[PDB]
Amino acid sequence: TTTLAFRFQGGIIVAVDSRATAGNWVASQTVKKVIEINPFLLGTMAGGAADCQFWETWLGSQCRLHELREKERISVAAASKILSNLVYQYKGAGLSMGTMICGYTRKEGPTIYYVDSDGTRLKGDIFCVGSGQTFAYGVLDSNYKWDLSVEDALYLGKRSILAAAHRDAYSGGSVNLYHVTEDGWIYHGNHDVGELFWKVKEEEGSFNNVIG
């Protein structure tokens, strides 16, 4: 697994791989690791697949109840804390989660919260979670600027997952991109890593170690 999310001028980019494994056996290449909590909030899936799926669609239900009662969009701070407080109640029972709760509101602007099954809740600009997280951090750290364009930011997220998919055995399949704006998230397609690798190698001149 490799999942990332970062803040920038134009909002938030969310990028994930698609692979799921049971030991060395590749169970699926078409897994959805971005949970669509609602039209304005996104969550990423790492650790336990069920734990992330179940509790983040539950989070969507709680967010919907909030805006019905308060007649106002829930903040990313409040939404992330509902999830972190919930998993903290289960601490010790064996839940497995590592997720980024991503959103863009009026009062906060673009906001990302890393939420963990041992109770951790961190606000930040760049987060990277999974078995291939170290590979993606390398590409992110050396190319990240606040004043990136939406086009260049989308590519940076796509390229960083590709870096992980190449080196990390347990990451790959395809890349799913998302762009989060104040008016909601926008899906930017599914990209097969097999086809993407050769395309990037030729156009970019990278991966000279690999024969193509």
- In this chain, which stretch among 81-89, 133-141, 142-150, 176-184 interacts with other proteins, using CB under 8 A? 81-89
Among positions 36, 81, 196, 201, the unique one binding other proteins when judged by CB under 8 A: 81
Contacts of 132 (CB under 8 A, 6+ apart): 1, 2, 17, 164, 165, 167, 168, 170, 171
Was 49 annotated as part of a binding site?
yes
Q: Name which of 45 and 153 has its Cβ closer to other proteins.
A: 45
The footprint of other proteins on residues 41-80 (CB under 8 A) is 48-54, 57-58, 61, 64-65, 68-70, 75, 77-78
120 Rama sector, left if φ>0, alpha if ψ -120 to 50, beta otherwise: beta
The footprint of other proteins on residues 125-154 (CB under 8 A) is none
Strand order of the β-sheet with 126-130 is 126-130, 2-8, 11-16, 174-181, 184-192
The SS3 call for residue 177 is strand
Contacts of 191 (CB under 8 A, 6+ apart): 158, 174, 175, 176, 177
Q: Are 110 and 153 spatial neighbours (Cβ–Cβ below 8 Å)?
A: no
9 near other proteins (CB under 8 A): no
- 1, 2, 44, 105: which is the annotated catalytic residue? 1
Q: What is the Cα–Cα distance from 103 to 108, expressed in whole angstroms?
A: 9
- In this chain, which stretch among 24-32, 136-144, 147-155, 183-191 interacts with other proteins, using CB under 8 A? 24-32
120 near other proteins (CB under 8 A): no
85 near other proteins (CB under 8 A): yes
Residues in contact with other proteins by the rule CB under 8 A: 25, 28, 30-32, 48-54, 57-58, 61, 64-65, 68-70, 75, 77-78, 81-82, 85, 93-94, 107
Which residues are catalytically annotated?
1
